[PDB]
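To the team - Z7T complex, inputs and output below.
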Amino acid sequence: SMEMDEKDFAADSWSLAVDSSFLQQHKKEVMKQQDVIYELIQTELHHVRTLKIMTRLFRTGMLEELHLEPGVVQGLFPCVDELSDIHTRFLSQLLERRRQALCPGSTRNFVIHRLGDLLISQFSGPSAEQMCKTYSEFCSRHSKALKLYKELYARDKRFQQFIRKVTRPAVLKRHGVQECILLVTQRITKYPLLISRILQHSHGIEEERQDLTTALGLVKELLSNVDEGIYQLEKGARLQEIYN
Amino acid sequence: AIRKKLVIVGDGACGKTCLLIVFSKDQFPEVYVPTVFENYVADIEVDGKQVELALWDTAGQEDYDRLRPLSYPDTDVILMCFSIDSPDSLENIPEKWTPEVKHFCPNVPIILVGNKKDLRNDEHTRRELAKMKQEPVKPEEGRDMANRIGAFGYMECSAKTKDGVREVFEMATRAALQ
Ligand SMILES: NC(=O)c1ccnc(NC2CCCC2)c1
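Output:
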């Protein structure tokens, strides 16, 4: 993450991020809505950060320091470039929506009134098809990536020293290789929980309640499709095992 | 310190997310209770042993039968949750959650946890349940279910007041060490 976005999302809530004199001017219902939208953007910033640790710290570090076969590194980090592209673009749109809503003379005071349209765009058309194909591929390769990691850590000394070295800082405590993989797999099932709670506090404008209801339906359709498209790959699986 | 992995399972209204949030922050949030929990690695010292306990939630995965099992690899202890204000969440324990966890996590200790124990003596809760010929889950009903499903043990807690929360995670760490 970059310092500017980290500071903007350092607080535990929207009500603690904005100035108290700005918070005071809003009704409780607006505050409750903004606290959940803030959590959606904050967790998206953290998810993009998880993807950067996987691409820049682990993947590129292995290619540069271990000179490991590119096919082995790909098995450990399936679809990480495509996932980073999808979520960095989504994060860019969420952060721009917040930035446009800032009051003049402030870098922290804002109210996002129109999130639904952005979520409909993300979870429909080509971007939704790309998310569907990418998570179907990622989640089907998840178990294989973990087994490949566990084999390499146990039999390779330079790989073990690489992992121990790059994961030693305290800021990496929750972000080991296996932890990043499960964090990415679990991300997509967080969206209906966040959107349903934003919707609960978005009845004030009928256009917004309708947009969030459509977005919620699109996210669930995407998840149902991803879930149906998963078939766990296994290194050294035989054709007979597959067709039976 | 040895690394252990804990996963919490249970129905959508069982309070598993709130339980993980309260333990990881050591507080019931006074300003905003998060909707979701990413992960956390707790430094725990139990009975003289230091453990790094990685915590994971299955919330949001309840309707997705092929995504949900991806949370299970290398799990060391399962917390199987139900809500005491929801006798229906207890009934789904033996024939939905238990066969699933025994299949993907053979030989992993399961601790059956009754959440929201504060609601057992809450007037509104008792009134609403009485309209459907029901009452809050009794301590013996929780123990009997835990005994029936082959659970390592039975425990109760309240994420709202923090009572029993520390004990659940310390016992989970001991179960993961066995
Ligand atoms: N027996 C222990 O070491 C212990 C007790 C209570 N909580 C612990 N976990 C931390 C993680 C975040 C909040 C405190 C650890």
